[PDB]
């Protein structure tokens, strides 16, 4: 039954700031996105140039 | 700063009954009760009442389909229509300060429908859908067949439009139905969270589809037939009944009490029903999951009484027979004087709880305010109920064992017995 289903462990992949299950993941969200989007925004600058 | 209030109840010269009640609730729930239903249909217009139920959102002379829906939603209101084989209720709920708004719509829908040909054509395929979801409960299917086996006419008519007629109902049929049934003398404008003078005013100054008793329904003739639907389901639902008591029939309370004495539904979650003669009996007979209950219906000119079961296919035989013995055993004085005392409590309780919700209170008021333009005090009703001897009950029980029975069952009926083996 579905009750016996659980999401595997993604610690071998999680970013450092969301590795701990008892910590809000929202507090590190803006940084996690700010960084990824920074890469993208920079690639856009290099491309425009 | 509000307090208590009276349950007024005028009754205009044209026969329209008006019952109101201020409970100072922040929410008002008005409704238009009417004596209409599949009961009044004939072979020719079968299902017309079902479609009419779904046609509530169609355009009227006063409001368009669009404004009816947008208008009512504009003020967090709602509009719905409930119906039985013999009565149709159109009620609207909304916050007090919007009763005026919502009212225009309730009015238009019940008295000024336009049943535009195209809107109607578009709506009919809905009958298929509405009916498909309803029939997901086996309960609904067997009750349909039940009334079809119990009667030869009127009440025998199904509550959901038969398939061969989906798409064939006409605007003329809807109009003629409304004209010959939605008459001032068969209607009642009931309301809660309102002031009689206000509700009373709306009725008279707005309700125009006029007087008369309209076309009267044919009398309900008992058949005592037997319909079996072999559909292969692991569970077998079966119902066995006998002509019971009619609405208001003195013999009503007797069956009500016998109902609660035999077993009228669970009271404890996942708990067994000990106070249930019928359940306890079936339980002793079968080891597998099942369900048994006392069935009971009261209509204007008739009623049905018996038991409804649900059991695995292989044990249907024993489960149904077990339920039968519990009825005989009861017809043969096998009813304690304390049993009748307990049942009378569950009955008084049930009734009293039924009116906790706005939907239940309004339905109680209007139901009675329709079939007798009056209102029995919750004490007189209790006074009438407990004043039911142990004899009465045993008699009701006898009337069942001796009366001609009709039966309906569906599922893998390979082990389900025929009415003449009970």
């Amino acid at each position: 039954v579905h009750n016996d289903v659980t999401v595997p462990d993604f610690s071998a992949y999680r970013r450092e700031d969301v590795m701990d299950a008892t910590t809000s993941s929202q507090t590190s969200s803006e940084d996690r996105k700010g960084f990824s989007y920074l890469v993208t925004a920079t690639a856009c600058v290099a491309t425009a140039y | 700063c509000p307090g208590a209030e009276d349950l007024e109840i005028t009754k205009l010269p044209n026969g329209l009954i008006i019952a109101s009640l201020e409970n100072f609730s922040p929410a008002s729930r008005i409704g238009v009760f009417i004596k209409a239903g599949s009961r009044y249909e004939t072979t020719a217009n079968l299902g017309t009442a079902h479609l009419l139920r779904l046609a509530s959102p169609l355009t009227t002379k006063g409001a368009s389909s669009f404004r009816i829906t947008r208008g009512i939603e504009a003020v967090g209101g709602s509009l719905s229509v409930y119906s039985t084989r013999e009565k149709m209720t159109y009620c609207v709920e909304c916050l007090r300060d919007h009763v005026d708004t919502v009212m225009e719509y309730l009015l238009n829908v019940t008295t000024a429908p336009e049943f535009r040909p195209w809107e109607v054509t578009d709506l009919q395929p809905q009958l298929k859908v509405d009916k498909a979801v309803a029939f997901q409960s086996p309960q609904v299917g067997v009750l349909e067949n039940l009334h079809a086996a119990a009667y030869k006419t009127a009440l025998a008519n199904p509550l959901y439009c038969p398939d061969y007629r989906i798409g064939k109902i006409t605007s003329e049929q809807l109009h003629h139905f409304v004209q010959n049934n939605f008459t001032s003398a068969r209607m009642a404008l009931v309301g809660i969270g309102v002031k009689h003078s206000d509700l009373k005013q709306v009725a008279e100054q707005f309700l125009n589809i006029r007087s008369g008793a309209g076309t009267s329904s044919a009398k309900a003739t008992y058949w005592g037939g037997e319909i079996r639907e072999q559909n292969g389901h692991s569970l077998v639902h079966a119902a066995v009944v006998t002509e019971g008591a009619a609405v208001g029939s003195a013999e009503a309370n007797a069956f009500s009490v016998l109902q609660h004495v035999l077993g009228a539904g669970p009271l404890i979650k996942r708990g067994s029903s000990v106070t249930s003669k019928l359940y306890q009996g079936v339980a002793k007979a079968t080891t597998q999951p099942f369900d048994a209950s006392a069935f009971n219906v009261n209509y204007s000119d008739s009623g049905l009484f018996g038991f409804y079961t649900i059991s695995q296919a292989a044990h249907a035989g024993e489960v149904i027979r077990a339920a039968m013995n519990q009825l005989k055993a009861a017809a043969q004085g096998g009813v304690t004087e304390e049993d009748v005392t307990k049942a009378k409590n569950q009955l008084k309780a049930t009734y009293l709880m039924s009116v906790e919700t706005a939907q239940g209170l309004l339905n109680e008021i209007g139901s009675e305010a329709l079939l007798s333009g009056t209102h029995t005090a919750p004490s007189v009703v209790a006074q009438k109920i407990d004043s039911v001897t142990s004899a009465d009950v045993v008699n009701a029980a006898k009337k069942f064992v001796s009366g001609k029975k009709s039966m309906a069952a569906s599922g893998d009926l390979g082990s389900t017995p025929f009415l003449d083996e009970l």
């Binding site: 289903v5 993941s25 | 389909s65 939603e73 967090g76 916050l95 007090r96 708990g271 029903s273 000990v274």
Partner: protein, 442 residues
């Protein structure tokens, strides 16, 4: 008028029996009433070993106590026309009775006896063990619930909220009479319980019987200590359970919610009111005010859809769920996400005006009878540690405007990583990345 009716509603009385318990009730003039105890317990309080205990308990809480074995317990309740129901969830449990106000006291005794002296019949346990296993197979066919379980299973993966209320197959097959016992003693405790009642009952008469049956007082400060649960981490992710043999598909998408105490919840509930809900039997059809509902009808996008703002102590799930044919999932998700974007970006005053009215009548509806009102009381003290009148709610609702809906919605929704659960014939539902993009601009 409306206002006046809100002010004239009888106030909710509260008192605390220094042993830790709280007794609250709302008085009316009804010969009938409902009373029960709302416990701050649930699957979230369980762990890997005792998951499904509180549920296993919920099954025995009605099969008899020490003072009175099964048959005796049932007969007594049945014979008085009272109704005994209850439920167990993730952060909240409840056992309540519907009966004649005339029996409020005997009931309170019965409640106390249930929560304190459950027989936990060794033989009944093995019997319910098989019943529960059957209920898990019954519920496994309830897509909507399989879907919300999965939504929690991934939204809160690795934590406590990830577990289901019913528990595991292994737990149910091996939970011990001692475990259930331990569960009860550990959680069913005065400071974490609320005796709620509504109908025609004397608050004092209620509190009196309360003192009489809920007596055991505490000495230390830790016995008056309600344990704060550890945080449950939210995770933008998805779980895809595919079975093309299923007729329809269920999809649920959600972002992390604030949690009970947060005022923003009034705004989220207004927002959800704008989007509303729908199913193929809403006569309103193509004229429904909910844009998503309109589109659903027009394009036949789904069989039904619903928004939700599920709260908890410190978190919540704000999202929506829909059922659609395998070939219309993509368009539905497209419009659903599209509407969320409109919320954060282009909400109208008209939109909220309507949503507000809709919300008011919705709150008023959750107080329709003694049981629903009682449930409000239990839940309110247990979550807000106090009852919140309809007048307060209306006060808060009235303050909400388009701008507010946008900021709040932009706050919890815009450019967030959602949690996704899809069950059934879901091949048409595009990948996470595509869905993730539906979280911004529009």
């Amino acid at each position: 008028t409306y206002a006046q009716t809100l002010q004239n509603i009888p106030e909710t009385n509260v008192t605390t029996l220094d042993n830790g318990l709280r007794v609250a009730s709302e008085e009316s003039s009804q010969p009938t009433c409902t009373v029960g105890v709302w416990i701050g317990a649930g699957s979230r309080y369980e762990n890997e070993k005792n998951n499904g205990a509180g549920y296993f308990v919920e099954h025995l809480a009605f099969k008899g106590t020490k003072k009175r074995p099964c048959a005796a317990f049932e007969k007594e309740v049945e014979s008085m026309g009272a109704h005994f129901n209850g439920y167990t969830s993730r952060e909240q449990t409840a056992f309540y009775i519907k009966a004649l106000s005339k029996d409020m006291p005997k009931v309170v005794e019965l409640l106390a006896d249930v929560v304190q002296n459950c027989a936990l019949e060794e033989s009944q346990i093995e019997k319910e063990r098989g019943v529960i296993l059957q209920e898990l197979k019954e519920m496994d066919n309830d897509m909507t619930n399989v879907t919300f379980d999965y939504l929690h299973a991934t939204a809160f993966q690795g934590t406590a909220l990830a577990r289901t209320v019913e528990g595991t197959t292994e737990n149910i097959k091996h939970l011990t009479r001692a475990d259930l016992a331990s569960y009860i003693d550990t959680h069913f405790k005065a400071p974490r319980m609320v005796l709620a009642a509504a109908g025609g009952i004397s608050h004092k008469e209620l509190v009196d019987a309360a003192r009489q049956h809920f007596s055991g007082v505490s000495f230390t400060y830790k016995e008056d200590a309600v344990p704060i649960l550890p945080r449950c981490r939210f995770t933008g992710s998805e779980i895809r359970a595919r079975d093309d043999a299923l007729p329809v598909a269920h999809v649920a998408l959600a972002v992390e919610g604030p949690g009970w105490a947060d005022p923003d919840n009034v705004v989220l509930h207004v927002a959800n009111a704008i989007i509303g809900r729908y199913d193929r039997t809403f006569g309103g059809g193509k004229h429904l005010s909910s844009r998503l509902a309109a589109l659903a009808v027009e394009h036949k996008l789904c069989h039904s859809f619903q928004t939700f703002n599920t709260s908890y102590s410190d978190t919540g799930l704000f999202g929506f769920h829909f059922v659609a044919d395998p070939l219309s999932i993509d368009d539905m998700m497209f419009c659903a996400q599209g509407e969320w974007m409109r919320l954060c970006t282009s909400t109208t005053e008209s939109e909220v005006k309507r949503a507000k009215n809709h919300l008011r009548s919705a709150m008023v509806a959750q107080l329709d009878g003694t049981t629903p009102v009682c449930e409000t009381i239990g839940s309110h003290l247990l979550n807000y540690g106090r009852r919140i009148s309809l007048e307060e709610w209306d006060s808060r609702i009235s303050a909400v405007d388009a701008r507010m809906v946008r900021d709040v919605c932009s706050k919890y929704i815009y450019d967030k990583c959602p949690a996704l659960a899809a069950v059934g014939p879901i091949e048409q539902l595009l990948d996470y990345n595509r869905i993730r993009s539906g979280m911004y601009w529009i």
